From Swiss-Prot:
Changing N909S: In HEMA; mild/moderate. This is Coagulation factor VIII. It comes from Homo sapiens (Human). GO terms for biological process: acute-phase response; blood coagulation; blood coagulation, intrinsic pathway. The gene is F8. Changing R1040C: In HEMA; mild. Glycans are attached at N199, N483, N710, N1008. Factor VIII, along with calcium and phospholipid, acts as a cofactor for F9/factor IXa when it converts F10/factor X to the activated form, factor Xa.
Length: 1222
């Protein structure tokens, strides 16, 4: 079936803590009937959310909006397909008027939408019972979301709604959103809610006791702002990975399930210690719906105070500011040795003998292992001037030993302080529900700490690692905030030249204490020692203040993450992950953090390894070039990689057609696994730079990587498997390369590029591409020019709000739909590469308008919105099923509105029509030349022209002929003939091509061919119709044929094959009897004998006796009718006349009326009045009448007015298909 939904934007009033400060919003809401009188019974626990739209596969959601509010809206879906008349975004998709009705519904309003849920829109084999999608009104997106325009779009797989078994309980939908009721359609507080409720006020979330439960998470909120959801009683399931936090991002779709198993009420809340999220919590009741041996670890631990040297033996002699603020004592500087309290491991309840400490574990307590089924036995004894505690994260059973019942008036063991000298015996037990689930690494990483004051307890050093594994090398990123540590005063009075030197809230004072630590140490002090070929695990944490997300990275290294290989790992605050690197690369490396404002403050450490058939070849150089992003004006000097040729970096290897989407991006540098990459890098530009790909697998024997200007480096390495994809992956995978002298200061410059590593026999012949599938590359960032190496020099053109457009939002460098190259086939796989790089603004949420896609990590998950944390280079695949112009956005307004978008062209590859050069529909004044030479005018250069003279020709040796389709078009193919004079064969044999979109900016042509330009091959005689195809098609309006080699005289007769932009040119099958004779009827059919001019015979080019429609009469009314029997979109009428028995008969002037249901008609008005269509001056030449308002309808009629001799019609409708309402 299809299931029709009724809607309405309906501006309503909202105050959060209810079903007292009231706020004004607008809110989708179902209505019962097309009358739009009654509303729909909506359950209490929804709140704002637009109704839950449940669609199967092969279904046809219809919808029917009604903007009852005081502003335009839309109905942009995500994750389903729609006929362009049902998108919902105004951008120059070069589409009609009837197809931008959907873009913005006005007040009063209406419009019906229709949605498709294709087999491609459905969910994969390892995808849930139902995908999680939304929809949002999409006029202004910032204002649309903050006002409460968002719904739940569910795409349940084929056959799945027969009320599955006993559906009874099942699922609820959570909209962890951040309505900023300030910057909305009515302009205040950034109101963190959950379905529209703040502060534990969300009524209805009810589970079953043993039955599980299914959450359809939806992120929302129009500006980065990370989030982090816990259900405190519980752990979450996504894919089949055990997760604690639903680490939701800007705009995000998840499908988590959790298994309630303990009765009660649990605080579905939002952690993130960055103070805020006022609210972002709500309650989750769970009542009871009706009808190889486990070992036992022992640990004697205690919490004893101590002196802590943050950076110890480090030479750290700097007194020239910055680094020194942290490590050197002075006038109002505690310095670097602060007093702290940590955990400490002993041997027995005597608590008199510590156990052997170790570097590579600074400040973090002992390692607590824990297999599933195993039991831990934590015996804890405080030893400090304060009451501390020890609770674990992840393990859920945690009652004290011996007895279950909790002690004094305490409700939970978390907040039961341990008085400074007593001994508590804890018993932790691990059940499978706390451990890994096949799809995650054998050990998951977890922490444990004190819970009498979650913050300051940990800011003193009360932290330690705990693993939960199935049936060493701990790294902890910790921002210890001394100014919250208890022992601060006990440190001032001991380390300051006057304990009266209070100051306190001095920014420089406080900021000189946020020590930025790895494990325990700072500033390249945590030097760890691992030999070669050791195959190591790395349990990696991020606990502390932090409140950002860290982008951790080993240097020249690569860890198997979630089954798949990666380079940068994103840890959210209070999250741990396990990564598996096979350390097969020598040298000394750094264990950094990317986020600049960190590694520049200490957070670094060193790795120090060492011990105890083809050859792909690239020539890239770093050229200083000038930019402007969107001129189609301030211009900025940037620097990019550029692919060259000779070792003498002379020829710059121009790119075209295929590589016109990089612009900023350096050149694709591809490789098959187990051959050799060699990049010969030369430095043009000012300042030195480099080329580091993290893959550069060196050879044994700090490893400089400096490239002073005019100098050249050779990187050469064998591309291994811990680089290549992985059976379950894709036929290729993307890494990245840039310069590693300043990691990011020389990237806002522009040095960036994609590096592919394809499977073992997929990189094809001498093309060195894959040709099977169109690969691309979208690099989303947010270029900050004020940070460049050239912000001085870029004074070729007082920091308040003058930044604004010193910060460009750049898909590949082109702000605001300024990105070209995105020209794609129709039905044809495409392998997009998705990156993001920079600061933590960059959690970009990329959305392929109208389009879904899929991605692979040891399984195949169908997605439709992929969030790009910086460092993560993905790789997706999609086949576009509809031809038009679409968008790649960034669904967070303030980041999209500021200009982060581009379009891509999908063209129907069965659309290939003669532009009109032969038929003449290309008029003479469109065809220009370069010295007509003489009488062989260029206005002749048409195919098949016959008349002794009949071509363009020129003695001149360097010439050219150009056209102009009047419009930008898909120039898809050119033919080529020649002429003959006397006994001479006039032909061209070797010609190139130029094209442009204004007439004064020509580009050559480079498709596939391995040269500076494609060199075509003309004819060999006076009739060799040579059909050259541009299989990398041409988008242009002005094409220009340049000959290079010629017999006798360069002389040509051509004809251009192409289609319009939105692929609407091919005939609707009049001539090829694809429209049954019965589908055509007319007012009158002249007939007697040797006749029957039946209206059935109106087909263009039709031959034979009695071969046109002819009314019995011949009056200026009359008509011919064409019931398409399906709503097509008509974009032109080709019309023609016949000659019968020395009586040429045609039709001079006709006009078109279009019905819809067969009896209600409307004449094609033009500029108010009616349009008299010209055409047909003789009795054979067809004449095409394009329509500037491309008429719709399934019915069509031709009325002939002024004719000639008699009325003889022959036609062929020029159109294409669609589907308008229902
Ligand atoms: C939701 O829960 C939050 C969490 O407590 C509530 O926050 C409290 O909100 C009130 C007003 O909405 C704040 O009052 C104001 O406090 C400031 C700072 O002291 C003071 O200068 C003002 O004159 C006013 O008294 C209150 O401080 C704040 N609690 C905090 C910040 O801890 C909130 O009220 C709840 N409801 C909503 C709708 O947010
Ligand atoms: C080594 O690098 C230096 C960098 O200054 C090169 O010197 C410069 O070379 C360029 C080559 O075209 C000369 O042309 C001019 O460049 C300036 C930019 O500096 C540009 O704005 C102009 O339009 C012009 O094309 C430039 O005069 C020259 N500058 C100096 C001070 O010598 C040098 O060529 C490199 N080494 C070799 C062997 O080429
Ligand atoms: C120059 O352009 C591309 C290089 O990017 C060449 O790739 C060809 O692209 C087409 C469609 O985009 C591919 O067609 C498909 O091929 C498979 C394999 O048989 C077939 O099963 C599909 O049904 C479809 O026909 C084509 O394979 C691919 N490669 C080749 C060698 O044709 C394109 O061919 C080049 N064009 C010219 C004129 O040289
Ligand atoms: Ca549209
Ligand atoms: Cu964004
Ligand atoms: Zn939150």
């Amino acid at each position: 079936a299809t299931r029709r939904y009724y809607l309405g934007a309906v501006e309503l009033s909202w105050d959060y803590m209810q079903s007292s400060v009231v706020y004004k919003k607008t809110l989708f809401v179902e209505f019962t009937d097309h009358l739009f009188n009654i509303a729909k019974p909506r359950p209490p626990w929804m709140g704002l959310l637009g109704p839950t739209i449940q669609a199967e596969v092969y279904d046809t959601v219809v919808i029917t909006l009604k903007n009852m509010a005081s502003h335009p809206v839309s109905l942009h879906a995500v994750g389903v397909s729609y006929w362009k008349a049902s998108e919902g975004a105004e951008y120059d998709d070069q589409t009609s008027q009837r197809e931008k009705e959907d873009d913005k519904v006005f007040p009063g309003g209406s419009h019906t939408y229709v949605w498709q849920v294709l087999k491609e829109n459905g969910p994969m084999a390892s995808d849930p019972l139902c995908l999680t999608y939304s929809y949002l009104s999409h006029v202004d997106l910032v204002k649309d979301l903050n006002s409460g325009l968002i719904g739940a779009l569910l795409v349940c797989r084929e056959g799945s709604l027969a009320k599955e078994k006993t559906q009874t309980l099942h699922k609820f939908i959570l909209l962890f959103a951040v309505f900023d009721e300030g910057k909305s359609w009515h302009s205040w507080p950034k109101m963190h809610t959950v379905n529209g409720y703040v502060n534990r006020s969300l009524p209805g979330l009810i589970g079953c006791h043993r039955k599980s439960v299914y959450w359809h998470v939806i992120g929302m909120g129009t500006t980065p702002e990370v989030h982090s959801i816990f259900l405190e009683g519980h752990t979450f399931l996504v894919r089949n990975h055990r997760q604690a936090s639903l680490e939701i991002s800007p705009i995000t779709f998840l499908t988590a399930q959790t298994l309630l198993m303990d009765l009660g009420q649990f605080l579905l809340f939002c952690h993130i210690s960055s103070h805020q999220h006022d609210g972002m919590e709500a309650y989750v009741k769970v009542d009871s719906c009706p009808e190889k041996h486990p070992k036992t670890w022992v640990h004697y631990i205690a919490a004893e105070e101590e002196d802590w040297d943050y950076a110890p033996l480090v030479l750290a002699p700097d007194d020239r500011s910055y680094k020194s603020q942290y490590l050197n004592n002075g006038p109002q500087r505690i310095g670097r040795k602060y007093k702290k309290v940590r955990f400490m491991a002993y041997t027995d309840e005597t608590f008199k003998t510590r156990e052997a400490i170790q570097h590579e574990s600074g400040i973090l307590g002992p390692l607590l292992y824990g297999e599933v089924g195993d039991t831990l036995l934590i015996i804890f004894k405080n030893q400090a001037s304060r009451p501390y505690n020890i609770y674990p994260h992840g393990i859920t059973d945690v009652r004290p030993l011996y007895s279950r019942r909790l002690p004094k008036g305490v409700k939970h063991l978390k907040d039961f302080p341990i008085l400074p000298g007593e001994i508590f015996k804890y018993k932790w037990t691990v059940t499978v529900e706390d451990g890994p689930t096949k799809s995650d690494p054998r050990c998951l990483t977890r922490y444990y700490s004190s819970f009498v004051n979650m913050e300051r307890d940990l800011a003193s050093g009360l932290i330690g690692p705990l693993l939960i594994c199935y049936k060493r090398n701990v790294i902890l990123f910790s921002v210890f905030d001394e100014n919250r540590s208890w022992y601060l005063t006990e440190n001032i009075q001991r380390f300051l030249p006057n304990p009266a030197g209070v100051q306190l809230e001095d920014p420089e004072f406080q900021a000189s204490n946020i020590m930025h630590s790895i494990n325990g140490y700072v500033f390249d002090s945590l030097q760890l020692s691992v030999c070669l070929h050791e195959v190591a695990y790395w349990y990696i944490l991020s606990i502390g203040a932090q409140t950002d997300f860290l982008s951790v990275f080993f240097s020249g290294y690569t860890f198997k993450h979630k089954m798949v290989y990666e380079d940068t790992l994103t840890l959210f605050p209070f999250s741990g992950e396990t990564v598996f690197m096979s350390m097969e690369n020598p040298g000394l490396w750094i264990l950094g953090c990317h986020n600049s404002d960190f590694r520049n403050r200490g957070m670094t450490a060193l790795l120090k390894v060492s011990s105890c058939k083809k050859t792909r070849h690239y020539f890239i150089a770093a050229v200083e070039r000038l930019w402007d992003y969107g001129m189609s004006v301030p211009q900025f000097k940037k620097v990019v990689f550029q692919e060259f040729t000779d070792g003498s970096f002379t020829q710059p290897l121009y790119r075209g057609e295929l590589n016109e989407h990089l612009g900023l991006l350096g050149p694709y540098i591809r490789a098959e696994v187990e051959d050799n990459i060699m990049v010969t890098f030369r430095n043009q530009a000012s300042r030195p730079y480099s080329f580091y790909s993290s893959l550069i697998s060196y050879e044994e024997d700090p490893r400089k990587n400096f490239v002073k200007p005019n100098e050249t480096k050779t990187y050469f390495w064998k591309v291994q498997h811990h680089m290549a994809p992985t059976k379950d992956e894709f036929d290729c995978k993307a890494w990245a390369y840039f310069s590693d002298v300043d990691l990011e200061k020389d990237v806002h410059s522009g040095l960036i590029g994609p590096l592919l590593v394809c499977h073992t026999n997929t990189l094809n012949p001498a093309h060195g591409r894959q040709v099977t599938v169109q690969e691309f590359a979208l690099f989303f960032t947010i270029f900050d020019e004020t940070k460049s190496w050239y912000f001085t020099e870029n004074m070729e053109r007082e920091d308040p709000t003058f930044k604004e457009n010193y910060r460009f939002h750049a898909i590949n460098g082109y702000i605001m739909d300024t990105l070209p190259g995105l020209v794609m086939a129709q039905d044809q796989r495409i392998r997009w590469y998705l990156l993001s790089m920079g600061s933590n603004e960059n959690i970009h949420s990329i959305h392929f308008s109208g389009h879904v896609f899929t991605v692979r990590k040891k399984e195949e998950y169908k997605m439709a919105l992929y969030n790009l944390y910086p460092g993560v280079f993905e790789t997706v695949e999609m086949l576009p099923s509809k031809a038009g112009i679409w968008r790649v956005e960034c669904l967070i307004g303030e980041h999209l509105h500021a200009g982060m978008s581009t379009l891509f062209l999908v063209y129907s590859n069965k659309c290939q029509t003669p532009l009109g050069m032969a038929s003449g529909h290309i008029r003479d004044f469109q065809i220009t030349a370069s010295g007509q030479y003489g009488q062989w005018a260029p206005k002749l250069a048409r195919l098949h022209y016959s008349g002794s003279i009949n071509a363009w020709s020129t003695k001149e040796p360097f010439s050219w002929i150009k056209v102009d389709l009047l419009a930008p078009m898909i120039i898809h193919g050119i033919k080529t003939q020649g002429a003959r004079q006397k006994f001479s064969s006039l032909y061209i044999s070797q010609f190139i091509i130029m094209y442009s979109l204004d007439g004064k900016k020509w580009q050559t042509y480079r498709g596939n061919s391995t040269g500076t330009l494609m060199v075509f091959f003309g004819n060999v005689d006076s009739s060799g119709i040579k059909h050259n195809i541009f299989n990398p098609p041409i988008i242009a309006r002005y094409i220009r044929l340049h000959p290079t080699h010629y017999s006798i005289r360069s002389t040509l007769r051509m004809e251009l094959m192409g289609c319009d932009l939105n692929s609407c040119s091919m005939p609707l099958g009049m001539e090829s009897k694809a429209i049954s004779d019965a589908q055509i009827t007319a007012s009158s059919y002249f007939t007697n004998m040797f006749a029957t001019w039946s209206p059935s015979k109106a087909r263009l080019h039709l031959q034979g006796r009695s071969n046109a429609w002819r009314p019995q009469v011949n009056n200026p009314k009359e008509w011919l009718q064409v019931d398409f029997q399906k709503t097509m979109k008509v974009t032109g009428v080709t019309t023609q006349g016949v000659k019968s028995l020395l009586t040429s008969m045609y039709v001079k002037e006709f006009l078109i009326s279009s019905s819809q249901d067969g009896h209600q008609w409307t004449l094609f008005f033009q500029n108010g009045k009616v349009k008299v269509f010209q055409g047909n001056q003789d009795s054979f030449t067809p004449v095409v009448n394009s329509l500037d308002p491309p008429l719709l309808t399934r019915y069509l009629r031709i009325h002939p007015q002024s004719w000639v001799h008699q009325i003889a019609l022959r036609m062929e409708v020029l159109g294409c298909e669609a589907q308008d309402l229902y």
